Amino acid sequence: SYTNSFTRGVYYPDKVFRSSVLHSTQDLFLPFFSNVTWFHAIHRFDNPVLPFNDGVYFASTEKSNIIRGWIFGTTLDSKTQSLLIVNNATNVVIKVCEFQFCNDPFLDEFRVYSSANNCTFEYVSQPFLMDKNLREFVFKNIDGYFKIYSKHTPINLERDLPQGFSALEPLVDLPIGINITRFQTLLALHRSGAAAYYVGYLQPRTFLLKYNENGTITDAVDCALDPLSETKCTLKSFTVEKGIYQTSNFRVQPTESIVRFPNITNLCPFHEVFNATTFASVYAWNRKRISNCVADYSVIYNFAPFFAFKCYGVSPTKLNDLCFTNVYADSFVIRGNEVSQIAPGQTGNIADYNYKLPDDFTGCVIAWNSNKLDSKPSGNYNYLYRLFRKSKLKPFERDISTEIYQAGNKPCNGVAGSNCYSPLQSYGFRPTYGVGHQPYRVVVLSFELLHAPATVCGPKKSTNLVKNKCVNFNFNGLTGTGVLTESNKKFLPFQQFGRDIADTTDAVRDPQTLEILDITPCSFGGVSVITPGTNTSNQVAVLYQGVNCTEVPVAIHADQLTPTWRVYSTGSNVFQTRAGCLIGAEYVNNSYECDIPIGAGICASYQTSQSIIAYTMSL
Amino acid sequence: EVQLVESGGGLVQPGGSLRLSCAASDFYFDYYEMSWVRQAPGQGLEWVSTISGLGGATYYADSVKGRFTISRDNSKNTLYLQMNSLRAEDTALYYCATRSPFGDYAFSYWGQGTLVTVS
């Protein structure tokens, strides 16, 4: 039997406390006004085991505890663990053990399973999972926690599914995650009765959940219903005003996320320039260029954290995701007084005649005290720094010219006497020194991200390349959403002529294999939604800018959608305009004052019963 | 603050190599990377190769791997490009662009470019 789910199945996505907010989540939910299976029971069964796709929305209106739990499993024949739940008189067991569920799934006293040899985690939870009244449960496995929800609500008189929102309160998260692809409803019988339960399947869809001040949910939108629902999930509100609005790609509702970030697995030798035997001096910094690596910055801050870990340009944390093309590691040792002068824009002693950072710098500088290893009884005399010069060094310059600085009228010829000195100075690192004289070893990491195949990326995992399907792609930092198609382009274009301010990515390259993949919009065409206001009515209209009333079914891919949208995106009283094709109105041949502008002078409103009409501008 | 004039590539024949020069008048940044950008009639523009300004490591494209070579001379601040085995896909306009390694992908200096036709 088939029925309709009247906006039921909205649970709490996470456990974070939220109040008086509107949160847009992207978890698995039950679509509103979907087709649920109303499976009845007679007394051995009426239907075989149902396939578990993403989640199960179980509902029951019977009483006397006929439906006494549930049974899960993949093949149920000595292959994997089976999630068994049975509600006893007061207690309930959630024993996930190897069970041989036969063709007799009856309880009344255990006859559902045949035997059990290898039993995994078992729960002895005391609160029973049983309590007319509608018993709403939402079972969903997220590969590590099998979230089960429940909402006990007294049902109405002579009805099956009430007309009212009821959010399911979350329960404990059971540690599961073994493969589950099928679901079956467990039933009981006094003497070898009848029952009936609703079953629905969850899909990945966005949801705008509204939390009030008390911390409860009162209304939600599936973001996959009629264009009013998409308008509801693009303005972050529940009271759409009387006016034409836009929407986003909430139609196809992508379900997969592809990463494909890295290409190699060899760790980077970042523990080779931070713990060297003898760091370079100030006048000659040993720059090390590194490419074809793995940008694993987890070993940097977890290395007895140092002082002044100031990362410019990029964020200090969340660096294990953004991938660059090369990393330049400079390392030297200075005094404690000018440990902050090595920064973009700073000016001083080591920022004028020594290593200087550029104005725009997307690297990070980190220094650490070395008053225990870089210290001598009479002070270290090996380290040197330039202090007497005349040419301001440009960013990323090295000057190893040990020639005698000319400062007098007559040539010094190396005597370094009156009015003539040496550019280098041996500042000793005496132990008995203040904070402004302690030796600090400083390492600067410059991140070069050029228009070249990125080599040193983060430790992010590698997903599978699923093409010809609306997915969210994060190939090499380009986080977008679209359909990946196999194009026939020679080389990836580099759009830099008009600076591409209001532009988007058209094609990308897989970092693993060199294949130019074109990115197409899953559903677009300038979809404008004409709304007269939620306070007035609930009838809307659609406008597709760039069609001729015939290319609209193939533009938005009206093949796998809701049956409530095919009435506003088909040949139902269409009207071709100079801007597009208005579907969902009736063009009148009268003259009225102008109203909500649909496009190209066309004004429309909602009146007479009253319905959405359209008329040209009455000049 | 200035422009980068180009010369060299005029009319060539299938099979050979011609030098492409890129000069600079008031350019003194020793860390800004310099690259070549090819644009063929019809489809958009593509990337040939680039030189890392922070060091001396050059990065070429996939089609120009074992046939192109770039060189940077800081004495007179010039860029030289030598392209070998120009069979059929080297008929385009080449631009000598310069951008900063730390920033966006968009270049910071647009040159005049020279048209090379392999016929």
Author numbering:
A (entry chain A): 35 to 77, 86 to 150, 163 to 185, 194 to 254, 268 to 683, 696 to 706
B (entry chain C): 1 to 119
Tell me, in the authors' exact words, what the paper reports.
Analysis of mutational events across SARS-CoV-2 variants revealed that the n3130v domain of bn03 contributed to its exquisite neutralizing breadth. This domain was found to recognize a cryptic region located in the spike trimeric interface.
Similarly, the mixture of n3130v with XBB (XBB S-n3130v) or BQ.1.1 spikes for an hour resulted in extensive trimer disassembly. The complex structures of XBB spike monomer-n3130v (XBB S-n3130v) and BQ.1.1 spike monomer-n3130v (BQ.1.1 S-n3130v) were determined to 3.44 Å and 3.68 Å, respectively. The three complex structures revealed nearly identical binding epitopes that buried deep inside the trimeric interface of the spike proteins. A total of 38 residues from XBB S-RBD are involved, rendering 1391.6 Å2 buried surface area of the XBB spike monomer. D30 of CDR1 forms a salt bridge with K462 of RBD. S52, L54 and G55 of CDR2 contacts R355, Y396, and E516 of RBD through six pairs of hydrogen bonds. F429 and F464 of RBD form a hydrophobic interface with Y31 and P102 of n3130v. S trimer-bn03 complex, the S1 region of XBB S in S monomer-n3130v complex undergoes large conformational changes, inserting F562 and F565 residues of the SD1 domain into the hydrophobic groove of n3130v and thus providing stronger interaction between S1 and 3130v.
